[PDB]
C-alpha cells in the first residue's frame, strides 16, 4: 500500500515526538516517491538534520530546505525542480501534507503541514499526504511560529525515514 514515513522533531534540542505521514502514492506517485526517498536519505541527501524554517500559527508549518535552510533551496531526487503532478487532492483541513513551491512547476523538497483548511492553495500546491499520528507534535511546532513565519525555537528534524 501507500508508504508511511516519519519525522522525529526537536525544538532547541528537546524531543517533541514523531510525526507519521501517509504518502498518497496511488494519486501522486512521483511526488510521494520524492518525499519518501528524501526521508530515507537513500539518494545521499534528504531531510535528516534540516529544519522547519517557516511556521505560521493558524496556517502551516514549512520545512524541507535542506540546502539553504531559509526557503530558497532544496532539490528533488529527479533534479532541482519537478512539475506539478496533479491537483486532485485538496487542502481539506489540519494535517494535510503539501508541496511548497515558487509558482507553477517548481516542486523541489520543501513541504508544509497545514494546521487549518487552506482552500486557496487548491490548484496551486500539490497535496500528497496527510498526518496519521503526531498532530500533537505539529501543534507544538505551530506554537513555536509567528505571524512573520520566524520560529521562536530551532525546530530540527533529527531523524526521519520509512516505516512501511
Ligand atoms: N526550553 S526549550 O528547550 O526551548 C523547550 C521548552 C518546551 C518545549 C515543549 O513544550 O515541548 C520544547 C522546548
Ligand atoms: N489563519 S489565516 O487567516 O487563514 C492565515 C493564512 C495565511 C497567513 C500567512 O501567510 O501569514 C496568515 C493567516
Amino acid at each position: 500500500g501507500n508508504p508511511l514515513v516519519y519525522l522525529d522533531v526537536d525544538a532547541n534540542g528537546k524531543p517533541l515526538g514523531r510525526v507519521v505521514l501517509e504518502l498518497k502514492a496511488d494519486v501522486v506517485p512521483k511526488t510521494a516517491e520524492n518525499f519518501r526517498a528524501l526521508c530515507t536519505g537513500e539518494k545521499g541527501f534528504g531531510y535528516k538534520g534540516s529544519t522547519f524554517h517557516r511556521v505560521i500559527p493558524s496556517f502551516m508549518c514549512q520545512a524541507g530546505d535542506f540546502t539553504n535552510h531559509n526557503g530558497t533551496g532544496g532539490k528533488s531526487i529527479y533534479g532541482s525542480r519537478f512539475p506539478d503532478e496533479n491537483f486532485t487532492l485538496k487542502h481539506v483541513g489540519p494535517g494535510v501534507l503539501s508541496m511548497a513551491n515558487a509558482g507553477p512547476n517548481t516542486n523541489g523538497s520543501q513541504f508544509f503541514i497545514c494546521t487549518i483548511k487552506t482552500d486557496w492553495l487548491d490548484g496551486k500546491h500539490v497535496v500528497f499526504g496527510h498526518v496519521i499520528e503526531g498532530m500533537d507534535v505539529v501543534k507544538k511546532i505551530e506554537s513555536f511560529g509567528s505571524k512573520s513565519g520566524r520560529t521562536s525555537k530551532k525546530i530540527v528534524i533529527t531523524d526521519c525515514g520509512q516505516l512501511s
Side-chain angles (χ1 to χ4, degrees), residues 11-12 55 141-146 149-155:
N12 293 338
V55 177
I141 296 168
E142 183 190 28
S143 81
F144 304 142
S146 67
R150 291 191 299 275
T151 59
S152 64
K153 301 188 184 294
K154 183 160 170 182
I155 312 295

Side-chain angles (χ1 to χ4, degrees), residues 12-83:
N12 293 338
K14 194 182 189 305
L16 304 182
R18 178 168 286 188
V19 182
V20 180
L21 302 159
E22 168 182 5
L23 311 181
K24 281 283 178 181
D26 56 334
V27 182
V28 277
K30 299 164 173 68
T31 305
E33 172 60 17
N34 179 59
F35 191 89
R36 185 202 67 75
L38 296 169
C39 288
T40 67
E42 66 195 63
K43 311 298 184 177
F45 53 88
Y47 299 133
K48 181 188 190 73
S50 67
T51 69
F52 281 79
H53 71 273
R54 177 175 176 248
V55 177
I56 299 174
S58 299
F59 179 24
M60 61 85 224
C61 309
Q62 182 174 340
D65 184 355
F66 58 81
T67 65
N68 293 347
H69 315 290
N70 67 11
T72 64
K75 60 179 178 178
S76 84
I77 66 169
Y78 308 117
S80 292
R81 299 290 182 260
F82 68 104

